[PDB]
Amino acid sequence: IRYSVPEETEKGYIVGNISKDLGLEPERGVRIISKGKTQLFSLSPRSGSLVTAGRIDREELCAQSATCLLNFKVLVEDRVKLYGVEVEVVDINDNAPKFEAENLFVKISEIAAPGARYPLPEAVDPDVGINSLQSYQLSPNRHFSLHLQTGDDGTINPELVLERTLDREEEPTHHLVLTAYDGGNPRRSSTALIQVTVLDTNDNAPVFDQPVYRVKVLENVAPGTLLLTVRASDPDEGANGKVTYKFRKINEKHSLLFHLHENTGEMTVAKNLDYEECSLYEMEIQAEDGGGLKGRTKVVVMVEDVNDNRPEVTITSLFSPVREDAPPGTVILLFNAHDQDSGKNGQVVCSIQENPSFKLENSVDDYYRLLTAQILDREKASEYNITVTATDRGTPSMSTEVHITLYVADINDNPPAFSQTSYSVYLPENNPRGTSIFSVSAHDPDDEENAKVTYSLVENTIQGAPLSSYVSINSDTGVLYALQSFDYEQFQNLQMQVKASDNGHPPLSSNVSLSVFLLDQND
Ligand SMILES: *[C@@H]1O[C@H](CO)[C@@H](O[C@@H]2O[C@H](CO)[C@@H](O[C@@H]3O[C@H](CO)[C@@H](O)[C@H](O)[C@@H]3O)[C@H](O)[C@H]2NC(C)=O)[C@H](O)[C@H]1NC(C)=O
Ligand SMILES: *[C@@H]1O[C@H](CO)[C@@H](O)[C@H](O)[C@H]1NC(C)=O
Ligand SMILES: *[C@H]1O[C@H](CO)[C@@H](O)[C@H](O)[C@@H]1O
Ligand SMILES: *[C@H]1O[C@H](CO)[C@@H](O)[C@H](O)[C@@H]1O
Ligand SMILES: *[C@H]1O[C@H](CO)[C@@H](O)[C@H](O)[C@@H]1O
Ligand SMILES: [Ca+2]
Ligand SMILES: [Ca+2]
Ligand SMILES: [Ca+2]
Ligand SMILES: [Ca+2]
Ligand SMILES: [Ca+2]
Ligand SMILES: [Ca+2]
Ligand SMILES: [Ca+2]
Ligand SMILES: [Ca+2]
Ligand SMILES: [Ca+2]
Ligand SMILES: [Ca+2]
Ligand SMILES: [Ca+2]
Ligand SMILES: [Ca+2]
Ligand SMILES: [Ca+2]
Ligand SMILES: [Ca+2]
Ligand SMILES: [Ca+2]
């Protein structure tokens, strides 16, 4: 005979009455013939019906078998043969479906196109039939949907559908909930936390912060200094987010002038710069990632001038000797100045040290003309030390120095002068014919020919004009010559005038009286 029983029922539950099926009143000495490790059954003498004495969990008995049966024999001592019975447990919904873990994740790439279905974790329910697993439901998401594959086997395969393309740069991971439902009401359920991990595709190219990097630096800039810093943006991950910087202008000398750190992207100075050589350095640099993805930006170096140059004087006209008769205003120097620098560093101030003798005049533009201020006189000063100082107007100031030595020429304006205003010479009567009797000296302040004395004598006729016959002088000896002997009784004294003239045109002359006195002797 067969019967049934609900699972997990308390001890003493109703089972098909045994006595009414055997054919005897509720003495009999009847006992159960089966043998288990433990037994869950015991017949009740109160009603003659078997009542279970232990909790029945067919999940711990038949597991997933659709029909769970417990067939056992029973023994009646009144008779000589046994009676075989069989009781099939039914299934109730007490177990909830279970997943493999509390947290499971699915890897999805960034390049994954919409329409891709990814396997979802499949749950398990110990129950059988309606009480077993029935359906799934997925939390709504803008990027995903749910897809179920029910089968003839009764098992459903769940998988998610990609609705919108994913992007890790906006959000790396998603958080969704997958719920599992059975059919045995009161229905159990099981939620499951799923994380959508987005992989990385190299779809981000490096993009520099600014499209143009600008720096303004002086020319005196020391090599090894840090010009600037260049940064590029790559939101990717790993080598796809790494940056490497290098110039695109690879052949010109600018590559030798600057240094660009391949990693840090620092623009530094390698060689000294010069505003006069070149002040506009336009270059184009480029950054790359792990792949061939690259970005460009322009770096512009602007150099500015610095006072590191001295003024340069070029002389056009020089007149080292000047005539002493020069009026105040005659030029003695003609030159100009020019600085290599620009602006206030290029303006020049040509200043002679203020002296009374000369003055400097800025005739036109920056051409300078050095002139005189008074009349010169080489008998008081024949030499002049001139120091023209050309200082630029920048800061700090740089001054070049031009030295001129000025020797004035000789113009004959000074006549020769004798040693005395008047000379007197004594000689006794006896006079050896043609002998020299005196010595007269003269001097001239001028130089060279304008100081060369040419001695002469006035031509006033003594009786018969023996001025030449009486006396003679040589142009250079400066000595007097008595030609004839003298008697105190013919003449006593003779007055002449000696002349001195400088031998150069125009000549300057000077006469001075000179008297010869004879002396008386024993005639
Ligand atoms: C303007 O300044 C210059 C120098 O800055 C003065 O020149 C003088 O020149 C002589 C040489 O010409 C200097 O030395 C001497 O040299 C001769 C040979 O030439 C030598 O024999 C001597 O033993 C001596 O070393 C001299 O030192 C130099 N300075 C002075 C003060 O005489 C020139 O005199 C200056 N002009 C005026 C108007 O002061
Ligand atoms: C001689 O000297 C006097 C005074 O120095 C001068 O006045 C006179 O003109 C001179 N004689 C001649 C011929 O120049
Ligand atoms: C899963 O869902 C069932 C039915 O919605 C609930 O009864 C259960 O408590 C869990 O929330
Ligand atoms: C769904 O809800 C259960 C509670 O029944 C959680 O344990 C689970 O992690 C998910 O959040
Ligand atoms: C000729 O010699 C006489 C001798 O007294 C000098 O006085 C004169 O100057 C000249 O040289
Ligand atoms: Ca159970
Ligand atoms: Ca069950
Ligand atoms: Ca269930
Ligand atoms: Ca992206
Ligand atoms: Ca990416
Ligand atoms: Ca990248
Ligand atoms: Ca320079
Ligand atoms: Ca300069
Ligand atoms: Ca300068
Ligand atoms: Ca003079
Ligand atoms: Ca000179
Ligand atoms: Ca003179
Ligand atoms: Ca003279
Ligand atoms: Ca005499
Ligand atoms: Ca005599």
Numbering used by the authors: 3 to 28, 33 to 529
Which sentences did the original study use to describe this structure?
By contrast, in vertebrates the clustered protocadherins (Pcdhs) provide analogous cell-surface diversity, but in this case generated through stochastic alternative promoter choice. Biophysical measurements with domain-deleted proteins showed that Pcdhs also interact in cis, through a membrane-proximal dimer interface involving extracellular cadherin domain 6 (EC6) and potentially EC5. The specificity-determining cell-cell recognition interface of Pcdhs involves domains EC1–4, as shown experimentally through mutagenesis analysis and suggested by mutation correlation analysis.
The γA isoform constructs—γA1EC1–4, γA4EC1–4, γA8EC1–4, γA9EC1–5—displayed dimer dissociation constants (KDs) of between 8.6 and 45.3 μM. Crystallization screening of these dimeric γ-Pcdh fragments yielded crystals of γA1EC1–4, γA8EC1–4, γA9EC1–5, γB2EC1–5, and γB7EC1–4, and their structures were determined by molecular replacement. X-ray diffraction by the γA9EC1–5 and γB7EC1–4 crystal form 1 crystals was significantly anisotropic and therefore the data was truncated using ellipsoidal limits for structure determination and refinement. The resolution of the final refined structures was 4.2 Å for γA1EC1–4, 3.6 Å for γA8EC1–4, 2.9/4.3/3.2 Å for γA9EC1–5, 3.5 Å for γB2EC1–5, 4.5/4.5/3.6 Å for γB7EC1–4 crystal form 1, and 3.1 Å for γB7EC1–4 crystal form 2. Unexpectedly the γA9EC1–5 crystal structure did not contain a trans dimer interaction in the crystal lattice. Given that γA9EC1–5 is a low micromolar dimer in solution, the monomeric arrangement in the crystal is likely an artifact of crystallization, perhaps due to the low pH (6.5) of the crystallization condition. We also found examples of small/large interacting residue pairs at the interface which showed correlated variations between isoforms such that heterophilic complexes would likely generate steric clashes: For example, EC1:EC4 residues 86 and 369 from γB isoforms, EC2:EC3 residues 125 and 253 of γB4 and γB5 (γB7 numbering), and EC1:EC4 residues 79 and 340 of γA8 and γA9.
